[PDB]
């Protein structure tokens, strides 16, 4: 009984920990989006002038 | 008030020269981009 408390629990830690570590992956995803778009303003721009 | 058309030409054409660079257009500043 310990030692599958000790097991399952184990399971529950390492499960979330994937679950944590899977969100910060969209962090540089947003930050190269913006700073590629952005551009799309100053053509906008160019081509009223 | 030919003398007067006259005198304010000249005036007008002599600040034109001492900008130079207009020609009364824009000659040397133009198509320039920022960002």
């Given at each position: 009984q310990f030692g599958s408390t000790l097991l399952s629990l184990l399971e529950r830690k390492d499960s979330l920990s994937f679950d944590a570590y899977q969100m910060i992956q969209s962090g540089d995803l947003y930050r190269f989006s913006i700073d590629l778009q952005q551009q799309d303003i100053d053509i906008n721009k160019a081509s009223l002038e | 008030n030919e003398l007067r058309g006259l005198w304010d030409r000249i005036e007008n054409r002599i600040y034109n020269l001492r900008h130079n660079?207009?020609?009364?257009?824009?000659?040397?500043?133009?198509?320039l981009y920022d960002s």
């Open positions: - | 660079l207009t020609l009364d257009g824009k000659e040397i500043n133009m198509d």
